[PDB]
């Protein structure tokens with residue numbers, strides 16, 4: 001069912017995460033972690049303190065899809081482990097230094113064609129698939145986007161609700 005999902009999304013904040021490769025989204029699903037550039041790390045740390053739930057909605061660049069979404073379970077922390085991120089051009093391990101802990105709510109894909117009807121007021125009402133890494137998605141757009149994903153029956157939202 002969708003009732004516990006809707007409870008988790010209640011009053012959440014939503015952020016578009018753009019990853020330059022699949023390997024790091026795969027690593028994030030396996031390890032329950034995410035790292036981003038400092039400008040976005042600052043925004044997510046602020047949001048984490050301000051909202052009952054901060055949801056990261058993931059999209060690998062050029063995949064034409066979202067790869068799932070997750071809830072921040074911590075602010076960023078340094079020095080816990082050297083997450084073997086696969087680094088593309090220009091990006092280095094010091095920039096991706098802060099690690100957030102995340103609980104996955106859905107590890108299933110959603111193609112961009114399925115969200116064509118959702119626009120993001122905080123990005124000039126462009127289609128929600130359009131946005132830079134770290135772009136905030138307004139509550140109603142973000143809620144409807146998350147509800148479009150296929151249910152992920154491997155995930156029990158009970159423990160997530162307790163983190164709140």
Ligand SMILES: CNc1nc(Cl)nc2c(C)n[nH]c12
Nearest residue numbers: 018019020021024035036133
């Ligand atoms: C592990 N975090 C990340 N990994 C890769 Cl390949 N790209 C990005 C971007 C564009 N923001 N955060 C990223």
